[PDB]
Design a binder for this molecule. Structure first.
Ligand SMILES: Nc1cncn1[C@@H]1O[C@H](COP(=O)(O)O)[C@@H](O)[C@H]1O
Ligand SMILES: Nc1cncn1[C@@H]1O[C@H](COP(=O)(O)O)[C@@H](O)[C@H]1O
Ligand SMILES: Nc1cncn1[C@@H]1O[C@H](COP(=O)(O)O)[C@@H](O)[C@H]1O
Ligand SMILES: Nc1cncn1[C@@H]1O[C@H](COP(=O)(O)O)[C@@H](O)[C@H]1O
Lengths: 161, 161, 161, 161, 161, 161, 161, 161
């Protein structure tokens, strides 16, 4: 039963959002992936948001670039926690994406992660850490993964050839 | 019949948007003023946008600050030209408002004006110029207003005491 | 009878402005294209602006980069609505272009669109939406185009291979 | 039992973080408030983080300004979801705070909220929504609070005098 | 005969440009002061620029804020050296003024000075140095003024009480 | 007799500064080119500045990148007008270069041009316009050059193939 | 014997630099305070730097704002470690000060601290730590001061009323 | 006996930090190189910092990118002077790296150098200048190196072919 949904504004955002899905495959977390555009498919955004709780979603990861309205508009139509990922734009290098997602007004929150693929991965890890509060097995797998990252750095202290 | 609607996300944006209305009072252009919140009242945003054409609007002036989603979400739900006004935010001084409104993707346009009260006035003036294309009287009133502004500067060339 | 004019500062801006012209070909909207430089051909800017109304232009789309004075100087010499498109500059990535076009003072408005090719396309769509207020046929073609974009996103929900 | 901890780098950040606590008072959510400095008390930061799970916390809200290392260093020492709030700095207006919290590398996530008091309130709301996934009463209290905010705007449509 | 002209877009810019004039009063350099608006009085801008040489000017100091088109449009209509002064704007703190003046394309130069009152003073000083190349008396008065500023700092080495 | 000097901080700045020299070759203006480093050869900077007037220089064009101290330090040791050109840096895209040259304090002025090759060319044109005030022949050649640029734009109005 | 010198460009920078001196008073470190202007007194800057070693200085703390050339020009004339403090400028809020000091090219280093009073205090502390490497008493006084700051935060965990 | 330590957050930072090590090889200064991650290996950061003095380190050079917490967290656990080098990040071009390292609060100082390879080299030179205060031989080698850089610029004044 998929407890987290990964949505994005364009299929072109998959370059970035695929990094969220990758973490879920490693940690073995069931998820739904879908393209929902705030500007090109506004009515689908509403229907999606309104039915998120019924479909069992406990966390939603939304990514978008430029005038990134996707994460914020989903959060306005549901009480399910929303995490936003700023996709790096061409002209402004993602600064516009970040400002559009992070500067939400009092009342409707969106947990924002880094700009780019690093943020997509982190959004996935954050959602996993949220689920892991009530999933001892996932909590254990997260623990092992984090130890693997640490150990890889510890067993390779010298960067020189 | 009001051909132009002035909307905003909060009653606190009125301190800025009131300058848009002041222009319409002077040019004698009927207008509707309303508070429509993209995040607090997402449903009303949809009904307002969907019925904008039937209600007779030919131009919509939407103001908002911070992660300003209001202008763009309206433009996504109607073919009525939308003009956005970035309200000056505390921390980022309206740069976040600007990027949220101006950086719209290909397909759903939003004509953006200056940050603050100057942009509010200009949104009204640009809307009046759009209407003036098919309104000879308004067109003439506009011409007279612009000559007044010009004349005022021409008859006060020395700024010194 | 061409009702919208697309002007630019250099022939090098065509890389971007050609995206405005493209929308007009799809929507079958007659238009005039011309290179008018605010700094290299200032007298032509004036003559062009002064005669825009007589030549039947109802909307003007001006694009420029760096110290983008073109859109704002045209708006100062005519009551015909002007839409500005910030061309992406090398050093500042279009931030200088944006600030030059959007920060107009009270009295002379310029509707600004996104930085780059997305803004050029949008300026064309905005001008089309303005004309469509008094053109039931164009309004219908705009409607079909917008439905085509939406449907393309709806019939391709999964971004995965 | 307090399921959420609110930490901050200085007692001077309380002017901002107090808005996070105000949300918990209204929603009736038990919380712990403490001053933990990443640079002045680095050892306490470690003990606090290491024992966060045993102490029963399911969400940590960390606020800080300038080179805001607090949120990230906590997230590095625990699997308990960390949400960061950038406190508005004097010179850079919170832009340095934002970048310090949001730009975390792949592996150690930190959900970032708006700059200032608005983000403090939203961190509390996001934390409450995370808990509300497994707390039907809190979930209902959240629903009621959000309807109150919506209703308030809907019954005050005209901002004018 | 006044060899230097000081122009500005608004009488409100005088609060900044008055520091340029103060320098000329001290150095005893004849100057002309006038309000020339690029957007409100575009025709006067042209006449002023076209006749600058015949009127005997050898340097023009133009100040403006926001989308500061004034300096550049003057430089486009005359071969008389133009020096621009960015006036500090409210929202963007003169960054928009700076970019509008400094980022001129190849062909039409504008020597830009600091933002605000410091740049106004320096525009006057740079103009005086240009004239001083062919004015031995002014050259000497400049030397004396600069030694006075130096001497003042040298005879007050301790800033403490 | 060379009346203008082109100096730079590194031989690597020639990629940009060569555009200043190019204008002088076209306009047939004698000039001196030299590498003077403010940080690597501080004593040579002083000797150069101190003897600029004796060597007959009437204008100095200095270019540098990053912490661009060259233009400002030359201006402090001479009354000969100094024009600064911000070389585009790698990390900050020339924003650091611009701020370092343009924000001079009251007393020591530096006329700043655009970032990059466009500014280098313009610095040369500005220096030429300064010399042309007392050189009827150069004034004529500048006039022809400007007409050639204008005419090239006028005889090529359509950017389309 | 004073082993550390605190210089600044203006007596107006004292409002910031006084915090560097306050640290030395508390740690009982002999220091010299002086106003040395890079632009108004370029000759004194050279004599000061050249004789810094003979005068017994082992660390130099230089503060300046705007186009802050002071720190770098001193570092160019001496091998005595220079630490720079960016003074908060009006318009750009110290960003220009930061870039002028921090972006030094390869060869001539300048250790840069925070913008404003916080950086002034830290320059003093960093200087004291450098001296403390060969001064056991100062080293101990430093240890005691740091424990005092830590203890203060540890014995005031609750910021609330 | 190695008196300076070069640490970094990833082995990917070696592309930049290798420029610090290069200066030390030229100047023949013994040094230790190691990968210490603030987020992936937080406990190693503490152990490293705590034992820096015992291992004889008199200066520590730490480099990191993005949310660069490494330099600041080391400085919090030791009195050994820390120098920070901002590694150039992809999205924000190192601006996030700079803000994360330089904006330390009062009490814990980190001497910051330029963004990129130029800062890495300079951090090494600054650490060498600190050691050279009590090493007449190193002081002499630094002196020769600096004269070699100056002379190379002096014997190649003309940048033209
Ligand atoms: N569009 C929107 C939806 N929910 C909040 N806003 C924006 O929040 C800003 C100020 O927030 P507030 O009034 O709540 O303090 C206003 O400009 C308004 O557009
Ligand atoms: N986390 C931390 C550790 N040492 C200082 N801070 C941060 O420093 C900022 C204000 O600086 P100060 O305490 O020196 O006044 C606060 O936002 C606080 O988070
Ligand atoms: N050059 C110009 C033409 N029309 C307006 N300005 C600029 O607008 C700024 C302030 O606008 P306002 O007069 O509306 O307050 C001034 O700096 C002035 O240069
Ligand atoms: N370095 C320098 C040389 N001449 C002026 N400054 C700088 O100018 C700033 C303030 O400008 P002013 O002295 O004109 O008021 C101060 O921070 C000072 O460092």
């Amino acid at each position: 039963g998929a407890r987290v949904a990964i949505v994005m504004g364009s299929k072109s955002d998959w370059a970035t959002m695929q990094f969220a899905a990758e973490i879920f495959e490693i940690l073995n977390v069931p998820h739904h992936v879908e393209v929902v555009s705030a500007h090109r498919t506004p009515d689908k955004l509403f229907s999606f948001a309104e039915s998120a709780e019924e479909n069992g979603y406990q966390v939603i990861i939304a990514g978008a670039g430029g005038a990134a309205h996707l994460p914020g508009m989903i959060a306005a139509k549901t009480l399910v926690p929303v995490l936003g990922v700023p996709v790096q734009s061409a002209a402004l290098s993602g600064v516009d994406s970040l400002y559009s997602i992070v500067q939400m007004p009092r009342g409707i929150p969106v947990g924002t992660l880094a700009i780019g693929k690093a943020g997509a991965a982190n959004a996935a890890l954050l959602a996993a850490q949220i689920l892991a509060t009530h999933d001892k097995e996932l909590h254990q797998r997260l623990n092992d993964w984090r130890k693997a990252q640490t150990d890889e750095v510890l067993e390779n202290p010298d960067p020189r050839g």
